[PDB]
């Protein structure tokens, strides 16, 4: 077999729309390197091509829906790491103040393309904030992510 459940796959379908700028269902080296560096890095095209070739079926320089999923489906379906929480935190919070509040979170969601509500973000944070101080720290995040 080579696939994931509606939940696990949920992130994959969505992710695909995050990588590709037009979300046509395929990401090329042009968009790859663009969104890649957009996060906070300055890699090379070489990685984009090589990495992509490792994911694309026809190896034309762009990954497809099943090609991206199948690759990540054959292995590693559900899991996390202390790094995902740190990197994540950096992806969520722009200034990375080691503490994200529902407000800033809402600003982030809508900043990327998500309309979150005050009650939604507030409930999302308070539910992830073990200390309930209005923000989320490392441990609070790592646990709320996997070690709930």
């Amino acid at each position: 077999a080579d696939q994931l459940t509606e939940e696990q796959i949920a992130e994959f379908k969505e992710a695909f729309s995050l990588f590709d700028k037009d979300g046509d269902g395929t990401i090329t080296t042009k968009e790859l390197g663009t969104v890649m560096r957009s996060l906070g890095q300055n890699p090379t095209e070489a990685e984009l091509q090589d990495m992509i070739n490792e994911v694309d079926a026809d190896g034309n320089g762009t990954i497809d829906f099943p090609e991206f999923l199948t690759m990540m489906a054959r292995k590693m379906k559900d899991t996390d790491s202390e790094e995902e929480i740190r990197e994540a935190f950096r992806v969520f919070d722009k200034d990375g103040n080691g503490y994200i509040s529902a407000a800033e979170l809402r600003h982030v969601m809508t900043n990327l393309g998500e309309k979150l509500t005050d009650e939604e973000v507030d409930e999302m944070i308070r539910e992830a904030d073990i200390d309930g101080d209005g923000q989320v720290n490392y441990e609070e995040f790592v646990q709320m992510m996997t070690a709930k």
Binding site: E7, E11, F19, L32, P43, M72, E87, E127
Partner: peptide, 28 residues
């Protein structure tokens, strides 16, 4: 930083998998 896979790709894989977890599948 994967071991022998796709950095940018896998990077996105984890990032998305993380946010999505807090996006909806958080307190399910």
């Amino acid at each position: 930083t994967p071991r022998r896979g796709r950095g940018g790709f896998q990077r996105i894989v984890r990032l998305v998998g993380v946010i999505r977890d807090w996006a909806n599948k958080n307190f399910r």
